[model samples]
Target: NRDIAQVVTENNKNYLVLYASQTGTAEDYAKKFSKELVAKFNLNVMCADVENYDFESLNDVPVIVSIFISTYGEGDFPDGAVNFEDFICNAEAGALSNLRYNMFGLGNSTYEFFNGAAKKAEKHLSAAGAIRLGKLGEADDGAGTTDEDYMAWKDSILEVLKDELHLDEQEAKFTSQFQYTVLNEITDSMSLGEPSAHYLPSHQLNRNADGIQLGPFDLSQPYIAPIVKSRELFSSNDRNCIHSEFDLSGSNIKYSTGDHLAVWPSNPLEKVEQFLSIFNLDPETIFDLKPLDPTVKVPFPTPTTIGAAIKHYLEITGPVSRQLFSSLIQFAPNADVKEKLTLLSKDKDQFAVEITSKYFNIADALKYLSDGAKWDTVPMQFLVESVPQMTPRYYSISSSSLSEKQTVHVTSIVENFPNPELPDAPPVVGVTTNLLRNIQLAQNNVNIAETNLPVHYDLNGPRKLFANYKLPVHVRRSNFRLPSNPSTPVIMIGPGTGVAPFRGFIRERVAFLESQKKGGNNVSLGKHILFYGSRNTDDFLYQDEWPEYAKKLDGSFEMVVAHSRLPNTKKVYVQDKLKDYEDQVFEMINNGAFIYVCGDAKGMAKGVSTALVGILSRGKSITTDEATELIKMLKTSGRYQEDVW
Candidate 1:
């Protein structure tokens, strides 16, 4: 129904700001750029998701186009950008002869394929005869310089635009694209705290005599699944890992082993209230938020209360970016506060040291900079545009579909750590996982404050949709899997929470064996080996189940355990264990064994790769270069797989 050219024609817009985002960063940047273009140059622009617009009509666009694209997981496009990538990259040469565009790529240099999507996009556009506006701009998340990089590139592009396009520039100022109107009273029809109007109590009665909601469940619309089971898995004081089961009965949603489950979590009630109080917003005050421009879209549904918007819609606790700091100077309460904010905004290293290293979120940073002074003059519209939306967190499914059909389990480590640099500041808390922990605690009837947990939430959600310990969830299919052939040997390496998918793998194998036995068929299973590591024996996940699974496999399975923090013993990790079994590992690899690694990608996964490379060199008596090439071949052939975060 909507395309770029059609929107431009309908809205009488001259520029298009398109974004391909994996985790909402590019989208935020695109929206920010759109505002800048309109404010500084008075350009008529329409900001849109790249996936929603057809590139076949890209040549028909009336004016210049700019893309803010981000790279995800090993050079692949985000879920929404796949079609755009395919169409633009596969188009014939000279197909885009009528097009001219600029590009800004968001990436992390820590990965092997840094800025891959952006580079490919620029290459394809140029190959299709589209002229590039300037040099491709790159933002590196690995260095925490994404915002800085974007600003530097945007400054250069602005100068070029003024010279080449003959555009007049005006003094840059903060302009609100949206109008926030606060009502004196609340209404019965308004959304109190639901995600959308569909979840309101009034709408729940409109089912078509079925008393059930069906879908096309996806990121846009997730299934409200009931948590059939919830419990703690570890007894450590420093961390809490929870194992939860989602009942997918009659939902029509299904999952296989090695799939991901996306959990949509609400912000903690404490943090939400802090945001509302600090901003002097009345929780009961009804409001309507509308975009003044026809081309812009309101991020969240309006006719909602401030409390509802903060609790369910906004990401209030994310760290403040350098770009946001630069924009907030005019809103500072006092002259001294304004001066400090100005200095921190311009000094990148100082900002990182004071704000970033301390893990101070937007509210925390603002309060700290102003010495606890209130920023009442800041427009509500600016806050809406500045804060990112609360996004769902994905977890590897820890239960096998074969073993428990209609049920999906997730293993999550509740993240909470202190900031050493700011001893008086609050500890860094994970929005979703800690919420999950609160639910788990309430379900178990444990007093939160009695324990070390610092927060609590409304366990029963709006209109009781999340009552009975339910959570919103959807399934994502993954390529990480057991070998297709039942007789193929497998090597699984998962440290800490990385053992999630491997649990599903072993369970699937056990279920397969049981099914074959019941069918009176003699299908011999191949070797199933799992290398799991943890801080101590207490944290060794699913230890009891492994022995039972090994029994059923008739000695075809082996579990190698590594305790990294055993008292008075040297820390032994999965990579160290892998090194000790060099001959056995290489023999299996030579016999075509499938190797799978999951968990922390930066340290454990990298170390495992190095260990494998060493084994390959010694086993084949080849040079390091040849061994590295062999590892590359294994990755290309899908023999070596990873589900790392």
Candidate 2:
């Protein structure tokens, strides 16, 4: 028993599982399939990230299964999976002559280029002489059918594999590692930081250290960043937004237009302690960990405590999956609880609707079922390892480094909600948003006395404790951008949190204008049209700055505000405001003007896009299909863009 440490793959394995994941869904499903293959069929199954596999070596693989998230930047493969995509596209027929594969694509159907990468990958793979095991499995996230589609595809794949592999008895044990005792003294004598033979790649494991890493800050080593400034951009009543400042001085880390900053976080201390007591896990556990593969690295910093692992490393406060609950039924205290867990596990749909979708953590889940009963058998390491790592939350970078050198800004709406599922359900404060807000509060020199939190965050700490005890953060570049020609007329439509990227755009333009003035150069300024909306005028963001910015732009900048709750009797949306300026919009679009729609993907952005299509159809006297095509053309031509959630 290796404590579920390694997902073993033998050299004799006939089947291969590959995943191209952005947000871990594909990876999770791949692991599930691997577990099934090993336990039920006694097959040697090798699962890997697409980035970890070479297409050239897949020549005679009897079975190939792939699960991919079809999230692409400008309709291309996801960033890190580019090498795999490129290799497969240009791979020789001889390399994949006898290959057989099955593919499941995860995507939202609402997008125009739906499952583009999946379609492209499947086509390329088939072209390279690999045959499909089943029909192309397209999991649509539009109606939230991703899970159901995956389950159906799993059944289909399993059936095909069963038939193809012939009769096989199930095995209870996982594949044992061919343990090679570490040459400890040999490695220790070399150097403190020198590589060892133990770190070398196995037959199935592909080594590409430089492939996935994008920035200076990574999981193994994170940047100890200081919060330059922060402000609670909302009232203390219920909802809140945080405007944070991060100092990127010493680090060579850089960012560009329309990028997102990943802010790492930790759970509140009180909650962590509560979890410790409920689970009956000792705060101290010094268990040794070995690397599962050449690609997989130790998640935590070395010599770290299990308590720290639970607090800072793990995702203990996430929703409980039915499958996990099913496995935990044996650990249930009583027969009644065990039966309930079994029932919930068997009826996944009802479990999803009533529990998982509602987001109930294990402690709260048990309490909800057992009338405040608790479990003590669950180990601390199990919680630390089993739960997903608490990853950094990405925020759209709201500053332009070109204009604002050595400074970056982020606009984040703090997420806090009173969940109804678990009555005493801890206030659902989003990980990064609250962190930003706290940083802002500290910057303002305001007392944190009134704040209701489980842990007291010290604004000042020891020298080695990073003085500020702030956060680890890094920025990731997004494909969203403004036209290079600054003189082109631009229209921006953003409502609520959607206004983040536009702030950077407007500021960059203002800086450009100022530069021309400084150089005594008479430059043709572009007409800047902004259509911004919020729930109420009182809740409007950047309210005080808009007027000043417009003045500096010398009347070139036009501002249209639609406060939905102004009259209380009628609500005016940003789309309605866009329609009001139809003639100007039409003229702008006709001319080389780029229109940016950034906000709520399902509602405001969708409404605005529909309104624009209508405007094009009515004004140009074009057919409805032509109007639709115009929208598509705009997106393709980099005219219509979005940074929606």
Candidate 3:
């Protein structure tokens, strides 16, 4: 029931910052920009989610508007911005003639549609007669220059903004938005160590009604499912993949065949210690962050200890942000350190060479910059608000819903790559996948210290509530699916972990056939083919399962495999296999075949699409343009679907 224009007038703010984020990066940038305006320019600024405001008064807003948004799959708006996008794109011309705005978009060069949502927004807004203050800005993630790109845009935009408004700029400084409270005593409420507030120390531990979480679990609230089973899928000396299963028997959490499983992973213990040591903070000290302003929000549920927040809630392993480094100069330990930070903040290439090339996170850079000096002058409030929170890593489900209704499974490749240039430093690793590896190790009684694992995690969560092989997880519904009719022809192409969803789809068909036979019914299924590729046969996922499925489906099912790294032979990929069977594939397509592609959005996915286009151009004797049009039509009609990363 809030009117955005009315609120801006009532609050007498000079700027309104609205954000649409896919993974919280854009939203973080919005908040940081808002703080910069208030702290330096002394401007009255408001930051808000685009979904919350009524845009009927959008044109009536008194002053400048800034938007920070990121594009999602296939050039679509994030879940939070879809409504805003539909409204603006369909609005009448001249409806926003009075509005003048600036926008910054987060883009990845790997995705075909770079800065797609922002491009559409500018097009729609300009079409509606709104004047853009400057060219739209974008940060490319694929190039690892999101932070640097943002600074370039922000610096230029701020200059234009100052000239337009005839405003004066103040010195860079820190103005705390949160009130810090250090607790001398701990109580029931102080122990906010559990996520979703469901597994506190006082809560019961049994699986009864009082013990287990009830229905309606979501992102903010998640069900704590036990790790029933886990194993290494492939054997290798330097790399590994984890296949883990979760037991959700009575949690009321349901997932479909192509849904995603989101597991919340805590920071590695080593990184957590490094963060605390860099800041010179006591790990056992209990604290709480209270918002001083109504619009300000505490990053996470507080009243928790310093170690707990750093270990379970905050993101400490991410790349160091340039904006944050510049903001922290005021708290530098010594004159030399302060000068060095200022120099690096202004010079992009030098900073990248010194810090980014080594993959040094904020703590790593901080400790190195100060020569192990403690940053006692910096307040926890600024650090907590600036560093982003830990977001769950999503893995595609690999188990069929009908076969495992109460259980969920995911196939994850453990990422633990070494940096040749910085051999002494800790190896670069992924947070969630490595956490899964640690779980698998603990479950099997493997000694972590004795093994080649790079880091360790506290598997026993808050107050040991997550002990006995349990993890905080939730399900996110997806659109990837099998055909509604079992007789519909299907072609599946996937490589590496991209084959996760295809496993579920094929298993679904197998289970459906079993149900039909049990009811004394006869059925004739259409051709179902899967094109899978991997480095070698031993690394092939579900090696034995494909033949088993082929047997169950009779002559209708076929498996085509490609081993790219075989000894003394030409390298092969799934796209080459598609070319070999182009004639049969074209024949199936004439009968309304459904084509599904998953994984390697930039490389394999693009190659496979090109392969299909070539096949169509040759078979139909049409130009590449006509073939392209036909393939796009198939995508528009949902016959051509992709679940690429």
Candidate 4:
């Protein structure tokens, strides 16, 4: 078993490596694999993105190493890994004759097509002539078993790789390619523009006619939906929440109780205009389009215009990366500019000193570079690859489709968080939140200033642009539920936006109470207590609706209100309100009453859980561990649930 002495003397060799990732998990694993091999076995290894690496090269590559891949969607490879799968399945036979490899697939068992992509890739690789070193390790996230599954697969793969490649166990050492750069007095222009050297495609690669028609499904091709309603929730001087109502009537899309509503968004019009001014590209120029790979089909409804993609498909508001800054060095305004970019890109402290600390977007990046000068070599593919594509954000559905069959409700707060780092910069706007805010103001049939901080969408167009476009939305089911025993006592705890679903829960309970009254069934609904906290009475959501609910439940509904800034020396939160009823709370729990916690994940949710544990330890005369286990069991048994982010 100890192959170190024999293999280290002369027999150790190299191996192949693969990574399939989304949001970087698989990529992280691949890097870890390469590190362990070099450190432990002194093996020469090349780690790469499956989409970026050529499987054809596998025929001659000496070692056939194991793969680390994670599945996304129903069961598919990460966005960048799709093409590599196609190559193994369709490439020329001689392309894979010299290849041999092993695989470990990551997925969730709750999905029907679990690890389908990994399985397909493995089978195709074998069909193309590579030898599989071990059985596929399908990691399931459903039962929280992914980490254990990975450990077992890792051990098995190590054994197979040792035997096949004659690797030796050795001491560990690290090799580094990435460096962090930091700079101060950073400008947006200096940080953004044409990149120096990176794999992202240059703008010239998008050689397609802009007027050609394309797919109806893409980040650029979103269906126009109107905002049915919007409202402000945050009471902080600098913060506000925009609640919007979207109409989902026209589309053929059908959703169950818990499906996410995907909204395709484009860069803000002002940002888009700024980028075009910098690039000097003709807004009217027609360019024919084509898919770069099988995975990337004609993006959006083409035959329209490039302006559409620029307007709707890209996320242009977030902070820029140091890698992007370094890549833009070629467009530096001067020699000192080039040096500064190089130093900043390569040094973290310098980068943090400049761009990262300031939170600059591309336009600001270019302006800073030229001392208000402009350069345009930034590639379009950077937008395609680096700039995150507009994806749908999820909202908890506040209406029961079972009750209101034709409509849905979303209770959202318009978000405007101040950036302590970017003093002069305009505050970063919440993508959907701002959009909803503008829609809300407009739907009230009120005119808003076009120059307001969070820029407006042109809702006056003939398509009704957004004026009449109904919002496409779906409901996502949650584990939060009512007791099966209608008589069971219950306690509900939620604060701020967390109260959205609880509104529906109470509404449903009221309906149940009414139905039972009509049927003459003796339904003894126990104490329905709610602990809610907000800034003040003015910002309390559904303020007018609470009295009606309390009346219907006949004193069954007890609401404890905690306001942080209402004539108080000390701020009051939901947990503080819960402690006031600790005795009754323990009695309810002892009598099989369910507890539900929701809202502000970091503060309210976390604090509430800790407080509950403390109560259990002191009140129930049980150890903390036992109390913790009991809470977990309650959650698993559906007595306790959370919708915390």
On lDDT, the leading prediction is 3
lDDT of 1 by residue, 1-645 (tens): 356677787888878889999678898888777777876888877888987777777877878888999987667678778899998889789988888889999988766568999998888988989999987999998787897888888878877777767888876567777787887765555676665465654455233345555666666777778777788888787778888889987577889999999888888888887788666776787788878777777776567877877887888987777778877876888899889999998888898888887887787888788776788888767877777887778999999999988899899988888777878766778888888888788778888778767677777776576876787778988888888898889999999999999999989999988998889987878787889999997787877788888888877898899998999999998999998998889999998999999996466766898899999999999987899889878887999988877
Query: How close to the true structure is residue 239 of candidate 2, measured as C-alpha lDDT?
Result: 69
- TM-score of model 4 (CA atoms): 0.66
**Could you give candidate 2's per-residue lDDT for residues 3-105 as a string of tens digits?**
1112222344456677887666666666666656665677666667777555555664545555554655455676778887898779866556677778888
- Model 2: worst 10 consecutive residues (lDDT sum): 191-200
Clashes of each: 0, 1, 0, 61
Q: Tell me how far the alpha carbon of residue 437 in candidate 4 is from the true structure, in angstroms, after superposition.
A: 0.2
Clashing pairs in 2: 230-440
What are the Cα lDDT values of the candidates? 0.82, 0.67, 0.84, 0.60
* TM-score of each predicted structure versus truth: 0.94, 0.85, 0.95, 0.66
C-alpha-based local distance difference test score of model 4: 0.60
Off by over 4 Å in 2: 1-14, 91-95, 167-215, 218-221, 292-299, 369-374, 379-385, 421-424, 443-449, 452-466
**lDDT head-to-head 1 vs 3, winner:** 3
Model 1: lDDT to the true structure: 0.82
